[model samples]
Target chain A: MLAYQGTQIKEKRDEDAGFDLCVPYDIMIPVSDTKIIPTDVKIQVPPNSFGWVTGKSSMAKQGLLINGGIIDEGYTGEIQVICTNIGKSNIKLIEGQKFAQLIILQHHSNSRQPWDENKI
Target chain B: MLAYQGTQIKEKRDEDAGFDLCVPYDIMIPVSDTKIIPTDVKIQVPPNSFGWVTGKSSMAKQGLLINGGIIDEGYTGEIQVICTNIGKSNIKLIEGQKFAQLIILQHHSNSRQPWDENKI
Candidate 1:
């Protein structure tokens, strides 16, 4: 379990190198009028890394809802977190608040294949 | 390309051991009754392997449909195929019929993480 500060973006080149990391492109939370709005919380996922973008169970217990949770292993660029304020009051998020937990895992060796954007 | 007989169940132990493989646990096809039924077809995905469970484009154009297409990397169970006979006639699948194609890819190096049953 590696700890990355929210401000740092991690990047990986190849399987031999490592996986890239990013933060949410936008942070969204409900404001005063029951409307959800975007925040400055940015996320970037590393290249070639498969991530499990799950809301912290503790945070979820506090009424935080994570709208998007699927993160592909080969996906690069910043991850935008769509969070909803289930609570009645407006919630404020600090720049480095641990909004989500990312679980990384080893890639299967035999299943390794190249990506062909045109194949689809 | 690696082709395995329908009877063989591929298994992978570790990164160095390679990815395990399996056939679908149950094959389903539509019969004369218009109700989709199970067939003898089977699919088994290897352990520690991530697979793209996609219906062959040529097969889809011919009216074959794949119901469930998500396969996880750490999953170690036999895959059951839920195929629908979109055609008007009864569809029959042989024991060795190529039901689906599995595209394997390498694991992200830096994103490797372990799984914990109790963590949830």
Candidate 2:
């Protein structure tokens, strides 16, 4: 993983499970509007695992929600979070704001085939 | 892993990495509002791994986003999703509606200790 700019990908605490991601630049998301916030961090997901992006608890309390958390395994690309303002008013996003967290996860190993809903 | 009600957690496709979660009852989320939707499912996250909850791409396109997806390892509880409407209008959630997904992930193992910011 590489932080594109001076921004760094680090946990707020040692016990924290996810790496905190910050905004690369200042931007605004209007009421009931969506914007793609860049993290400026490019990462290659480990084999047999994926990257899961999630909204920060503090941001979620203010009605800021993030989408598109699933980054497939072996994907090497810049990480961007799709943020939406679900509050009653517009939201101002500052540069280097802690908006989301990136978590690495190992997925189940299964052969590619049709999924059986009845057997779940 | 167990589905509390008839709602089962299953993948839409064999190649999909996450298991789809559905609503257990009918609910309405007003515009710019938030609601807790029940899944009627209980899961015990495996040791050294965690369960990741995330919003589905299909639901995200409709302006519905999910929150609070970080399920710590060994937590035995029902999986509930926090749904927020960030769209222009209200969203009606029907029972059995696929709203989110559950992805099991293996976290990086390290002894509990204070983290050094300079080493990230």
Candidate 3:
């Protein structure tokens, strides 16, 4: 079987939020700047399936939440995430720290158009 | 048909990121402050299904990306989103804008135990 190729995983503890597994942003980001920090991950989807990426509850409780929309089956690129600090104290993104995870779902593709210009 | 309800729908423009159908964030957030502004959504799942939320490319072009996790088969609340200003200019978050979308799919509930909370 090919390696389970998707988002990364880590083990981070949350005293309040009830989750254990984790992953994290690539660098130390300043809370003072609202710039979205890119995550250290990417993905490729199989036909008729897609991915939904979301924020860890532990990360959410810390004022860091993942926010965005769907990954259709035809998309192949670096899977990205942005962390926004919502809490009072500034926090480092802490590489490899638990934050994001993916849900592989069976997609009923409603696609009719494929670009004819590039069949790479 | 009891009105298939999961997320709302709107129309927006995106020169890239091909798929269509849209939703928007709740309010205007300043770029200078690194804070999370929740989207006007929450989600819940059924016994044998889950949800995957993701970012729209048009929004991503505006430096607004949905970053976050899996909506397991048992959550019910406002589906939230975090939009960050990754662009060079600060932008106002217009209401009813198209940004986030939800994908409902089949889930093999590996859930061995269900919570024993008071039923609402």
| Best of the candidates, lDDT | 2
Question: lDDT, candidate 1, residue A87?
Answer: 60
Write one digit per residue (lDDT tens) for candidate 1, span B60-99.
4334555564555444344554565443445555544455
Lowest-sum lDDT 10-residue window in model 3 chain A: A111-120
Q: Each candidate's TM vs. the true structure?
A: 0.34, 0.58, 0.48
lDDT of each: 0.42, 0.69, 0.49
> Number of the top candidate by DockQ?
2
lDDT of 3 by residue, A1-120 (tens): 011343453333444222222444456545533445444445555655555666666667766655553555555555565555556777666655666666655543232232233222
> What lDDT score goes with residue A30 in model 3?
51
Please state the Cα-based DockQ of model 3 relative to the true two-chain complex.
Answer: 0.11
lDDT of 1 at A115: 31
Ranking by lDDT: 2, 3, 1
The TM-score obtained for chain B by all candidates, in the order given, is 0.48, 0.81, 0.57
Tens digit per residue, CA lDDT, model 2, A19-117 = 888777788888778877766576665455667788778988887877777876545566667778767787887887777888766685333344233
Give model 1's docking category: incorrect
Candidate 2 displacement at residue A120 in angstroms? 24
